[PDB]
Write a protein that binds this ligand. Structure first.
Ligand SMILES: C[C@@H]1C[C@@H](O)OC(C)(C)O1
Ligand SMILES: [Zn+2]
Ligand SMILES: [Zn+2]
Ligand SMILES: [Zn+2]
Ligand SMILES: [Zn+2]
Lengths: 330, 331
């Protein structure tokens, strides 16, 4: 004698309970404190809850059982909101720590050691006074890392090594940010199998993606429905969503399957039910081109890949097996 | 007639000796709640703030204006707790300071006006506490977004009657552009305090604004890194001008006839996360009196320089009362 679980906003769950998992989503993309200070920007807090519950229930009916909400502190993560909508839609939600693209002064001024302590607090102790523990660490670059972003990448690697929770990233994929992120992570001793290089469907450079995957990284093809096709007269929507079709993004899933990387693909929508960190109309514009919301992956992408010949066992591997392996702490 | 505080409305007469530019905790939105251990704990910050407010109260202070905005990490529930425990009135602020997040930076002048009106007319967050002042900031020539903030502040002030108070880079004469923008919106100068005005020695700049009816915020009197020359971060923040140099600007404005335009404060805090990690400890070593520095140090200094007590009472009691009392709403 003397010689299994993932944290969600409702508490620990076993691996088997996660099921079909969307690995990069947002209940509400905002800013720290903003939902509490100005809920009327979203109509009301109650209206945002109702919208998220409706959308999550639709995703659940399409087969989704878990989402990973990769909103950080500076993306306005409100874990109490996540917990309310998770409960009322009966969909598990994994919450995130880390930092995204808009850290305030009180974060931007901190050392790598301080950031490590903050990420560890959110994983090991809880987020705010809620007792809800993060189950993933989110980081971001937008091209070459700023000095602070390098600190965040290192603190994320250290927090991952101390807890076993994985790291997921925002990239400027066309600037191959995953390469710099990988270099910094490996300089900290982090295993590539603990890292998802996200927004990787924003590029068509397959050689960039297969080289990362041949190093063991997971590849996040996570913005499949993001497209401004049909919105060409809308500059702000076009700038955010791009002019590449959802089908072009979905073809990358098949391409990576065909190149042997099915065990390293993670798929998602990068959808939201509220969105205050961009132009005012953006949520309504996005909803007008993708009414399916987070159900877009199961309702549209799965049939598209099935028509292309991808067998169901491969699709189950990508949507069930891969997220469970990634999220289970090492 | 009544001034909104974190404990509800108070009569103008209850405000008493008022410090018009202070902070319980200078932070970032959501930060105190997400990482209270940065301050030791929330409980430690409460105890420190209550002790510091009691020290100010024993020295005669009865009200402070906490000019922390949303993006400076204002936690009005913290303000209410410490105000009640220390029995010092606290007026809370709306507006935006120097660190707005994307969800604010992307907003139009109309949207910002709505947000400021929400915090004044409805309440801050879900607390029911209404803001009694609007805080805005520039650090040099205004950015396009800062111009929107100045205009929204003017519009919210005209609609509600609550005054406007500003952060300036005083040595770059920011108050002149702020005044121009406020006046283009029809805002009365007597409802505007041009803050951090003690950061400059240019009396011609200060007296010209005062002559136009602007209030002059000499609000950082104890900020000095004299003796801390080997500390670059403290030197950059606090400057190398003495508290006596800053205090003598109060006398200079009095001597030139502008007593009625003066407001005085410490610009102190009990927690501070938006700068380098040890700053609050360093500031506390410089000024253990905290917010009591104005009454315990500046008043006796000016008294012995010949400023009558009744003049100092007018500056610390009557001037803030006139500033904070809301004007009639437009229409
Ligand atoms: C809050 C999220 C972050 C990242 O996923 O980008 C989008 C535009 C989807 O907003
Ligand atoms: Zn992203
Ligand atoms: Zn995202
Ligand atoms: Zn200031
Ligand atoms: Zn201040």
């Amino acid at each position: 004698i003397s010689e299994d679980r993932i944290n969600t906003v409702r508490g620990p769950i076993t691996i088997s309970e996660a099921g079909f998992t969307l690995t990069h989503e947002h209940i509400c993309g905002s800013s720290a404190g903003f939902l509490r200070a100005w809920p009327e920007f979203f109509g009301s807090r109650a209206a945002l809850v109702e919208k998220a519950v409706r959308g999550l229930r639709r995703a659940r009916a399409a087969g989704v059982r878990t989402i990973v909400d990769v909103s950080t502190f500076d993306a306005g993560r409100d874990v109490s909101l996540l917990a309310e909508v998770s409960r009322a839609a009966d969909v598990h939600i994994v919450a995130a720590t880390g930092l995204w693209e808009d850290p305030p002064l009180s974060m931007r001024l901190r050392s790598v050691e301080e950031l490590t302590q903050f990420f560890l607090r959110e994983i090991q102790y809880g987020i705010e006074d809620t007792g809800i523990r993060a189950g993933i660490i989110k980081v971001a670059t937008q091209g070459k890392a700023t000095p602070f972003q390098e600190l965040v990448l290192r603190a994320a690697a250290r927090a991952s090594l101390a807890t076993g929770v994985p790291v997921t990233t925002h990239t400027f994929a066309s600037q191959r940010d995953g390469e710099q992120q990988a270099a910094i992570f490996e300089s900290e001793g982090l295993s590539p199998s603990r890292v998802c290089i996200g927004h990787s469907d924003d590029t068509d450079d397959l050689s960039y993606l297969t080289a990362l995957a041949a190093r063991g990284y997971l590849i996040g093809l996570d913005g499949i429905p993001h497209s401004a096709i049909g919105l060409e007269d809308n500059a702000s929507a076009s700038a955010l969503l791009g002019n590449r079709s959802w089908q072009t993004r979905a073809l990358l899933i098949k391409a990576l399957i065909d190149q042997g990387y099915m065990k390293q693909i993670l798929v998602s929508n990068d959808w939201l039910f509220g969105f205050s960190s961009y132009v005012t109309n953006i949520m309504d514009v996005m909803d007008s081109v993708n009414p399916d919301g987070m159900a877009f992956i199961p309702l549209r992408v799965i049939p598209f890949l099935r028509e292309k010949g991808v067998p169901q066992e491969t699709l189950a591997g990508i949507t069930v097996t891969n997220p469970a392996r990634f999220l289970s702490p090492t």
